[PDB]
Design a protein around this ligand. Sequence first.
Ligand code: HEC
Ligand code: HEC
Ligand code: HEC
Ligand code: HEC
Ligand code: HEC
Ligand SMILES: [Mg+2]
Length: 278
Amino acid sequence: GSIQTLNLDITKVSYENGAPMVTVFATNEADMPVIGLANLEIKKALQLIPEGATGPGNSANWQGLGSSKSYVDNKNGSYTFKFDAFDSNKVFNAQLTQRFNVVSAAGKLADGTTVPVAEMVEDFDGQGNAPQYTKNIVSHEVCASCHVEGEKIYHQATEVETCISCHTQEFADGRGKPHVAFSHLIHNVHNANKAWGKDNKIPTVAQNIVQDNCQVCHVESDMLTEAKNWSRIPTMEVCSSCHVDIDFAAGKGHSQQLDNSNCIACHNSDWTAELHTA
Ligand code: HEC
Ligand code: HEC
Ligand code: HEC
Ligand code: HEC
Ligand code: HEC
Ligand SMILES: [Mg+2]
């Protein structure tokens, strides 16, 4: 036997003991329960710092609250996670949107059934109900135009939301490498103005296919309410991924900007959208 698609749905989030308890339901392509998953995990628990809160003009960004591999198989298709060490930095804030990134590793069930990789994110408010605000800009579908589905893109994972959940601005800044925040990295790896990674790769191949065409990734969707952030939210952290010759701090290539407080006053969405579009 072999499962074609593994679907993961979060069916309940409850905060008791403070820490969240999260129930996941696993189904196959025929919507039948999948029991016995041995490699299910909450790869990341996050919360969403809203636009502005880290400073003026700044992007919303994801703050880390931990992860969990500790769960009970409820033997009907559902699995319930607990956290042994939730929010170790003690920043949990029930006012913020909360996200869980759930993944199941490819493998096999007790009876030898093969099961593929699965990944998802879902967002909630601070008590497990619907989220009041989101940062939904891009979804995986666009990457599947040019990257084989179900296979890792570069490393770690197969879907863009998983990448975004680990490659946070906090993660990048904590390691001393702002360029590894996903909103920087993704433009960098497809744009030839600057090399990337351990082999100092110049992305000529990506450049010639993507051609800085924002609309191959940034598309309108009812499911993605922040899709217009690509033109609405100019920051030095992101815009510099391709505009690599500006030094905002020293005023080289541009007037000095010591933060993102005023970018949008000049770089209005209409202008940014129009000038970057063929
Ligand atoms: C075609 C229009 C593309 C879309 C949409 C996306 N990517 Fe892409 N990517 C593309 C090419 C032609 C290449 C270069 C491959 C090469 O071997 O040189 C890439 C590269 C990446 C990489 C770097 C991998 C590498 O150079 O080793 C990553 C990490 C990457 N792409 C991720 C990615 C994601 C997450 C996308 C959706 C948001 C996405 N790409 C779209 C072509 C295209
Ligand atoms: C944490 C759980 C990760 C997930 C999920 C993904 N990545 Fe990752 N990535 C991670 C680390 C710790 C590092 C090293 C960063 C450093 O200190 O150097 C990386 C690195 C990359 C890179 C290289 C970036 C650069 O050097 O400029 C790329 C291109 C990259 N990661 C891409 C990527 C993609 C597309 C992901 C989803 C498919 C992905 N990463 C997930 C940690 C994690
Ligand atoms: C896929 C290869 C992409 C192309 C081409 C472009 N963008 Fe992009 N961008 C993409 C991703 C995966 C993300 C991260 C989304 C997340 O949730 O973190 C982004 C992000 C931006 C942002 C940041 C918005 C914010 O709220 O801070 C901006 C301003 C942005 N992208 C602009 C941009 C422009 C102008 C492009 C064409 C010149 C462009 N993007 C291409 C993926 C890709
Ligand atoms: C790579 C995917 C890019 C990202 C991310 C951003 N921009 Fe960009 N920009 C890009 C290209 C290829 C070009 C040249 C287009 C052309 O027709 O020559 C541009 C150009 C600009 C300009 C005009 C500059 C000029 O030389 O007259 C501006 C003002 C500009 N871009 C702004 C901008 C901002 C504010 C961004 C973050 C939201 C941003 N760019 C991202 C490629 C890329
Ligand atoms: C009005 C006082 C501005 C403020 C505040 C910011 N920018 Fe700007 N920027 C402005 C102009 C008039 C231009 C030149 C446009 C042209 O046609 O050449 C720019 C240029 C940029 C570019 C393009 C740089 C390049 O490679 O040519 C980018 C990416 C850019 N600006 C981004 C940006 C950001 C992120 C800001 C806040 C930190 C910002 N600018 C402030 C006008 C003004
Ligand atoms: Mg680059």
